[PDB]
């Protein structure tokens, strides 16, 4: 048969999901960033845990080690490119200081809310899922889209969107036709 | 696994013959045509033994 292809889980159940502390932290995070469920928070926590475990393992190794230098520089480059890690903090120690809230901030939904295209986080999610938002020339319908520093300045209404210069939606033209009739 | 019970021992009688042959040679220490031719229970018996001797007694 055809060769196997790899797949992996992007999240992990927390150790003790019934800690009240975890429940209230998740409540705050979901409310602030309009998250649909806890699987998203678990996904972000899993990614952050992997990153911080890698950074700890790097910080274990002696400074000037080839492996440390190379792969740590790669990690800093990726983190700054995603925008999570600021330009002035390009060190693994600040990587260990990272948080879920920053990755949530870099989500597209939060950015459509912040830039003023939407009046609320949930309105931003609606607009993104609804095919009204475009990064550059590409329409993105995924709230979990992680925007880069360069891509941040290109978020706008899509050319095909009624808000971006296209014709009015079905509701608008239906009401206009009924009014004319 | 050599001598496990099989689902249908009759259907593979030839295989069983080999197993008995292997069992014979393996345990021997403890004991001590041409087809392609042109033309072709105990407790009760002990119980009675005790009875009869008890009578003869």
């Amino acid at each position: 048969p055809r060769a196997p292809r790899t797949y992996s889980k992007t999240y992990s159940t927390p150790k003790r999901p019934y800690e009240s502390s975890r429940l209230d932290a998740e409540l705050k995070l979901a409310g602030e960033f309009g998250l649909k469920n806890k699987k998203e928070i678990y996904r972000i926590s899993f990614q952050l845990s992997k990153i911080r475990r890698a950074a700890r393992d790097l910080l274990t190794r002696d400074e000037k080690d080839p492996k440390r230098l190379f792969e740590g520089n790669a990690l800093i480059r990726r983190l700054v490119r995603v925008g999570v890690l600021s330009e002035d903090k390009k060190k693994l120690d600040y990587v260990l200081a990272l948080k879920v809230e920053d990755f949530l901030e870099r989500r597209l939904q939060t950015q459509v809310y912040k830039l003023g295209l939407a009046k609320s986080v949930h309105h931003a999610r609606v607009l993104i899922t609804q095919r009204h938002i475009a990064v550059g020339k590409q329409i993105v319908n995924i709230p979990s889209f992680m925007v880069r520093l360069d891509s941040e300045k290109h978020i706008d209404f899509a050319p095909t969107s009624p808000f971006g210069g296209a014709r009015p939606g079905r509701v608008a033209r239906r009401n206009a036709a009924r009014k004319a009739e | 696994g050599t001598y496990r019970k099989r689902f249908n021992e009759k259907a593979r009688s030839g295989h069983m013959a080999k197993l008995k042959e292997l069992k014979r040679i393996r345990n021997k220490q403890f004991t001590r045509p041409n087809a392609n031719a042109e033309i072709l229970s105990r407790l009760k018996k002990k119980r009675l033994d005790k009875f009869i001797e008890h009578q003869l007694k």
């Binding site: 048969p1 055809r2 060769a3 292809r5 | -």
Partner: protein
């Protein structure tokens, strides 16, 4: 199995070919020929996955049986013909000549060459022996038997063969200071100069090689191919000159 195998599955194919694991289930099994199965690049892979002139099979077949492809100056029509190291592939219609030489990564590289260089190849002398009627001959790494060789030619030497006539034009002896190419192992594709040949009777001989950067590495003798003297290769080298 009750006989020779005729199928090669993609995961079991040589890694250096760079075959997609999801394109299919089988890979082109090299037919019998001059080179080893694992050390050969079948013409289908060359024409499709490397040169991109053909998109898929029967177009490779059609290219072949129009007689546009010549391997070592002879027309071949077998899709899985096992072209290998130092083989000359000529496409007259497009006016291209290629020599099959591994890059530093260890995979066969698409190296374009001139006609004058395409007129000849090099063969490592695998064997030297007298044939019937007291006729000496040399067997090279590509299975070429050349009768009546020069007496000075010994095993591990390299003979320059003219493709048109299949005769030895010159030869290079295996000695320290010679320019050498690695044709296997983890150092496969690197180029250097010989330093010492460690000899073990009844065992595999080991050779020390020093690159232009002065880095030294050791490799088994079966993995060694003389290509010239230091600073004067007899063939054109890929980009990077077998460094790193």
């Amino acid at each position: 199995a009750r006989g020779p195998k005729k199928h090669l599955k993609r995961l079991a194919a040589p890694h250096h070919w760079l075959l997609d694991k999801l394109s299919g289930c089988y890979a082109p099994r090299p037919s019998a020929g001059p080179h080893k199965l694992r050390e050969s690049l079948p013409l289908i892979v060359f024409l499709r996955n490397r040169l991109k002139y053909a998109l898929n099979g029967r177009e490779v077949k059609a290219i072949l049986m129009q007689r546009h492809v010549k391997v070592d100056g002879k027309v071949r029509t077998d899709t899985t013909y096992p072209a290998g190291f130092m083989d000359v592939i000529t496409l007259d219609a497009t006016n291209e000549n290629f020599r099959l030489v591994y890059d530093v990564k260890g995979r066969f590289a698409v190296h374009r060459i001139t006609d004058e260089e395409a007129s000849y190849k090099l063969g490592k002398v695998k064997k030297v022996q007298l044939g019937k009627k007291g006729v000496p001959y040399v067997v090279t790494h590509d299975g070429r038997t050349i009768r009546y060789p020069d007496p000075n030619i010994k095993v591990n030497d390299t003979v320059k063969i003219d493709l048109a006539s299949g005769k030895i034009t010159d030869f290079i002896k295996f000695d320290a200071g010679k320019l050498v190419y690695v044709t296997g192992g983890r150092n496969l594709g690197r180029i250097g100069t010989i330093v010492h040949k460690e000899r073990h009777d009844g065992g595999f001989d080991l050779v020390h090689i020093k690159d232009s950067l002065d880095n030294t590495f050791v490799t088994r003798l079966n993995n060694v191919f003389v290509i010239g003297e230091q600073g004067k290769p007899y063939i054109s080298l890929p980009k990077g000159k077998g460094i790193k």
